[PDB]
Design an enzyme around this catalytic site. Sequence first.
Site, PDB file in Angstrom:
ATOM      1  N   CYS A 261       3.603   1.350   9.714  1.00  0.00           N
ATOM      2  CA  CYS A 261       3.300   0.593   8.604  1.00  0.00           C
ATOM      3  C   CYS A 261       4.709   0.080   8.036  1.00  0.00           C
ATOM      4  CB  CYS A 261       2.341   0.970   7.544  1.00  0.00           C
ATOM      5  SG  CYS A 261       1.209   2.480   7.922  1.00  0.00           S
TER       6      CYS A 261
ATOM      7  N   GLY B  20       2.435   6.276   9.493  1.00  0.00           N
ATOM      8  CA  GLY B  20       3.635   6.136   9.346  1.00  0.00           C
ATOM      9  C   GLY B  20       4.477   4.853   9.815  1.00  0.00           C
TER      10      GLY B  20
ATOM     11  N   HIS C 194       0.841  -1.185  -0.021  1.00  0.00           N
ATOM     12  CA  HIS C 194      -0.029  -0.176  -0.025  1.00  0.00           C
ATOM     13  C   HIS C 194       1.004   1.250   0.055  1.00  0.00           C
ATOM     14  CE1 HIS C 194      -0.012  -0.207   4.604  1.00  0.00           C
ATOM     15  NE2 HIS C 194       0.242   1.186   4.247  1.00  0.00           N
TER      16      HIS C 194
HETATM   17  C1  LIG Z   1      -0.091   1.736   8.686  1.00  0.00           C
HETATM   18  C2  LIG Z   1      -1.475   2.178   8.237  1.00  0.00           C
HETATM   19  O1  LIG Z   1      -2.601   2.281   8.616  1.00  0.00           O
HETATM   20  N1  LIG Z   1      -1.336   2.588   6.716  1.00  0.00           N
HETATM   21  C3  LIG Z   1      -2.469   3.178   5.927  1.00  0.00           C
HETATM   22  C4  LIG Z   1      -2.973   4.281   6.676  1.00  0.00           C
HETATM   23  C5  LIG Z   1      -3.457   2.016   5.620  1.00  0.00           C
HETATM   24  C6  LIG Z   1      -4.971   2.140   5.824  1.00  0.00           C
HETATM   25  C7  LIG Z   1      -5.922   1.030   5.553  1.00  0.00           C
HETATM   26  C8  LIG Z   1      -5.301  -0.041   4.922  1.00  0.00           C
HETATM   27  C9  LIG Z   1      -4.140  -0.293   4.991  1.00  0.00           C
HETATM   28 CL1  LIG Z   1      -3.314  -1.837   4.409  1.00  0.00          CL
HETATM   29  C10 LIG Z   1      -3.229   0.842   5.269  1.00  0.00           C
END
Ligand SMILES: *CC(=O)N[C@H](C)c1cccc(Cl)c1
Lengths: 304, 304
Positions: free
Chosen positions: A145, A143, A41
């Site tokens: 992730c 951030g 993503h």
């Molecule tokens: C780490 C995180 O939450 N990243 C973004 C904001 C996100 C939102 C929805 C789904 C996914 Cl995989 C990632």
Amino acid sequence: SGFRKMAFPSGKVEGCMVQVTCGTTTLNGLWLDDVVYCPRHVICTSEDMLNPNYEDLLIRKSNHNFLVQAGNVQLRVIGHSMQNCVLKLKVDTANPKTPKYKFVRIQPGQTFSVLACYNGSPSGVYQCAMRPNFTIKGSFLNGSCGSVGFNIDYDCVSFCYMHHMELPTGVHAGTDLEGNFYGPFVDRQTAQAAGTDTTITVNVLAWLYAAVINGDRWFLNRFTTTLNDFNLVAMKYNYEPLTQDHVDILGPLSAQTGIAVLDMCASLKELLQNGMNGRTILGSALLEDEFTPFDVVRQCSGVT
Amino acid sequence: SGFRKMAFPSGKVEGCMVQVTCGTTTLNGLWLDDVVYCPRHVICTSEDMLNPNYEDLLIRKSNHNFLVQAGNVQLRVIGHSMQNCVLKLKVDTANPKTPKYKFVRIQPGQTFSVLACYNGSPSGVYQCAMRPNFTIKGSFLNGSCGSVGFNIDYDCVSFCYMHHMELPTGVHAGTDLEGNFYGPFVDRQTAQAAGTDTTITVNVLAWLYAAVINGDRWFLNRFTTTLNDFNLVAMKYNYEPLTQDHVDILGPLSAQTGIAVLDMCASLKELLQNGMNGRTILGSALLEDEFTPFDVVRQCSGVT
Ligand SMILES: *CC(=O)N[C@H](C)c1cccc(Cl)c1
Ligand SMILES: *CC(=O)N[C@H](C)c1cccc(Cl)c1
């Protein structure tokens, strides 16, 4: 003596954390040998997150669109592939700080250490359990992730978790390092409820043996029970059913403490039926389930 | 979102841990530049521990009696001095992995990360508070002595604790890195009671602001209080008296959450007078006091 919610030393993993930027999205990547692993993503705009086509989104992207920075030096990307929900970015340089590592899928109820990162910079480390419902109760801001979970056996770092998203309920979902989500979750900003979470019964018993070893014994009672009888109680209190496999794994703590497993189950039975009575066990006012039998043995013997 | 008892990433400190052996005693040392810091009781036999003369014991020792091993390579000792309760061993090689570091004496109620080591090998990391009575409730087995506590501000590691001994009560005592014990303790195996420990009131309030930020609000009540009124309650429940200095330090959390400090004090007042009622706050069944206001801000903003 003393018993603490203890993380693995995070050095071997710090040396792997990089920043991955694609368009205007930054998150954390894991640089091992000549590959940087990150959540797929990274290629999306928060708009795409509502129903992203990752095949289609990734076609628009070239090696040069992926900006990979380890500290203050940029890594040159010579390959990109999608595997499930991770991108693998081939870089022209093998990470000099690559530790001995494996990719492992953990079982629910297993623990691991999380090195929370922002912009490929470590901010902290903490010990987690994979919930029975394949969520984790982490501490993960915007951030965060691409932050990874791990275990360490002497020199070998087994990577088991990469952080993907936060559920509306405030709990965390992510993948193994082959990009397969733990649980029924998808990398999309949608309605996704987690199942019923249970308490990890074998971990609570493990933690009760850590108490006895560390002096806290007020909860040892005159009673014993049966797997069957104890499981009627576990059911009533949304605890995992206890199996002979759980009993076998508790043998070392049973042997070290001389307290039969079903006697400690009888202890847990009365604690569940009668609560703590305003008392504490190892400085906790509830039954802790985020230490494994292996976690109690390791910390109650001094394994480095 | 989520709130976790989070340690500093321990890498910068792992690269400093060495083994120090004198006679048959092994424990951990801290190699910074061309100096290895360790507890001075490395020079004793468990017999000496009953009333050691460290002046006299150290006279019998030469540079060559101190065996200093970083991993699988021996360090050559060219100088030894005693400073209070630490030995400084001058080695001929500056540690290539020496981070930016300071020695700081912490105040009681401050937190730090402990990298528990055995034979100069890190086994785990966890977050601690200096108790008001200058003890810490660690996890420290035989050979854990010389394990250090630290804080990290971006790149700079402030060393604040070196582990010396375990009290008969199961709590831990140690020195700053100039070898000065926190608390009235001496490096001798004797009767040494710690004072009355209190609860760190400003930390509990800090942690209550972390709850509100992270969704847990059931304990917000219709009431307010005065410093004076709240301190009569703090007294009754062996909580630190709250000062304007504590109020000032809580301003950012007060401002971020819009909940006045004395309103959150009123919240804490009712929690102390009425207990939790079988409920939990951030997955805890008691009032946590081992997060500082700085610890709540750092973890609720994402500082690396
Ligand atoms: C780490 C995180 O939450 N990243 C973004 C904001 C996100 C939102 C929805 C789904 C996914 Cl995989 C990632
Ligand atoms: C770490 C430790 O406990 N070392 C030995 C056993 C010890 C005993 C008593 C006093 C001191 Cl300083 C050290």
